[PDB]
Amino acid sequence: PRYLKGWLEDVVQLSLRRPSVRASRQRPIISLNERILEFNKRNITAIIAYYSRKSPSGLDVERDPIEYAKFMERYAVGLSIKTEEKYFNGSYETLRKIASSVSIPILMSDFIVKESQIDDAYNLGADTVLLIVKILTERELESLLEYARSYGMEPLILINDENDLDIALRIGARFIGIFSMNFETGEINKENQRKLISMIPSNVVKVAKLGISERNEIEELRKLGVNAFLISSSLMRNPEKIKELIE
Ligand SMILES: *C(C)CC(=O)c1ccc2cc(OC)ccc2c1
Numbered sequence: 001p002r003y004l005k006g007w008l009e010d011v012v013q014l015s016l017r018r019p020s021v022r023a024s025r026q027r028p029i030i031s032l033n034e035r036i037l038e039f040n041k042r043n044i045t046a047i048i049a050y051y052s053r054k055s056p057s058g059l060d061v062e063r064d065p066i067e068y069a070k071f072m073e074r075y076a077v078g079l080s081i082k083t084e085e086k087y088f089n090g091s092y093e094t095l096r097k098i099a100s101s102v103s104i105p106i107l108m109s110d111f112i113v114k115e116s117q118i119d120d121a122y123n124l125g126a127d128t129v130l131l132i133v134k135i136l137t138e139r140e141l142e143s144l145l146e147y148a149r150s151y152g153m154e155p156l157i158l159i160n161d162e163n164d165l166d167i168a169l170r171i172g173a174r175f176i177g178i179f180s181m182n183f184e185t186g187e188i189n190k191e192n193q194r195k196l197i198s199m200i201p202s203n204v205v206k207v208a209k210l211g212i213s214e215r216n217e218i219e220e221l222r223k224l225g226v227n228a229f230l231i232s233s234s235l236m237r238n239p240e241k242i243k244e245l246i247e
């Protein structure tokens with residue numbers, strides 16, 4: 001990984017030590033990016049619902065993961081499952097149980113810094129993985145992209161700024177998650193998020209992290225080329241809100 005400071009350094013060190021799983025996959029790879037394109041063609045708003053027991057954002061919600069997943073199966077384009085343990089209270093067992101319970105695409109959201117974590121995602125039933133430009137050297141990012149692609153996954157590449165985008169495009173990203181998160185305030189910079197979206201080629205599938213969980217924001221972004229939306233706290237708090245977001 002890159003050399004880091006603070007809690008990202010900590011979580012990367014934890015991740016490097018994470019024991020791998022041994023399990024045979026007995027679930028198809030259900031492509032998230034393709035399902036998003038399908039929703040776009042059908043004019044159905046495509047929302048990727050997070051399951052996250054905790055978040056550094058103040059998030060502290062206990063709710064049954066299977067009940068949540070089965071509810072979202074009806075509405076969401078896919079699920080994003082936090083599997084990082086220390087800051088998000090995630091677990092591989094929770095991912096496995098969720099994957100064994102629904103047949104919509106599942107993104108394993110963690111801090112992937114070694115190949116065996118991609119093996120873990122595959123073996124546990126996830127359909128793809130998050131890769132984070134800001135924690136990986138360029139060579140690592142390219143290699144891990146290729147390694148995920150070796151399983152038939154297309155990873156979601158997380159960018160937070162223009163430097164991350166330059167790297168992501170150079171290494172061949174085709175599925176990009178645009179955050180533009182400030183870690184002091186914990187707020188999405190909407191202006192910058194929009195600038196980044198405008199800089200992405202038309203042949204990249206684009207997912208925006210939503211801070212403001214409202215229909216009008218979705219409509220503006222969709223107009224600007226965004227294909228799908230990641231939404232976390234508001235859906236963990238009130239799952240049924242997704243219905244009003246998709247109309
Ligand atoms: C989960 C709700 C968000 C998450 O897992 C995550 C990971 C890494 C990351 C890096 C950023 O900048 C480099 C911004 C946001 C973010 C969110």
Ligand SMILES: *C(C)CC(=O)c1ccc2cc(OC)ccc2c1
Pocket residue numbers: 007056057181182183184185186188209210211232
């Ligand atoms: C999504 C609207 C917020 C999100 O993904 C996120 C991820 C990680 C993170 C870390 C923080 O501490 C450094 C603060 C906020 C925050 C928000």
